[PDB]
Amino acid sequence: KFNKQKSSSRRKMRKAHFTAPAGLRRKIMSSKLSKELRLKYKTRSLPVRKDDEVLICRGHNHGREGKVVKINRKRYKIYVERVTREKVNGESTFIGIHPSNVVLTKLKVDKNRKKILDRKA
């Protein structure tokens, strides 16, 4: 913006969003952190891991809480346990949720994640 090196064109920014490397995709699988935890760490946002616990804030399933099943980094969908959906034949899969539609409560904290939390503090 005030920097005149980095582009503000729509076209390039979109292209970067779509052709993103896996690490870049992982970066934009971030979610807002739950309100007391947010206060505790003074941390707005964290990248989700597969075993985390979210509350859904948008879509028809808003106000459902639950553990995260699977992440699809590539096409930008997380899967949550209580947003099941049956297919056309009646077979059950999970509804995909955009990561900005959910707020994160319980983070699973590994050594690396702890080091990141330490960096944020």
Partner 1 sequence: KLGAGYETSAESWGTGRAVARIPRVPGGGTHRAGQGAFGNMCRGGGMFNPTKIWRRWGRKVNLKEKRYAVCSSIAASGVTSLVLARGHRISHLKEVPLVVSNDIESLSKTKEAVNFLVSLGLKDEVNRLVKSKKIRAGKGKMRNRKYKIRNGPLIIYENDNGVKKAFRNIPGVDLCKVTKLNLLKLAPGGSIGRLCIWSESAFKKLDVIYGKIHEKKVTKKNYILPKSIVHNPDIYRIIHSDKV
* Residue partners of 113: CB distance under 8 A and separation at least 6: 49, 107
- Candidates 10, 74, 75, 119; binder of partner 1 (CB under 8 A) is 10
Nearer to partner 1, 1 or 111 (CB): 1
CB of 113 to RNA, least distance (A): 7
Does the protein bind partner 1 through residue 8 (CB under 8 A)? yes
| Partner touching 107 among partner 1, RNA, none, CB below 5 to 8 Å by kind | none
Per the CB < 8 A criterion, the answer to whether 33 and 46 are in contact is: yes
Residues in the chain that come right before a backbone break, where C and next N are over 2.5 Å apart = none
Binding mask 16-35 for RNA (x = CB under 7 A): -xxx-xxxx-xxx-xxx--x
Does the protein bind partner 1 through residue 9 (CB under 8 A)? yes
Binding site for partner 1 (CB under 8 A): 8-10
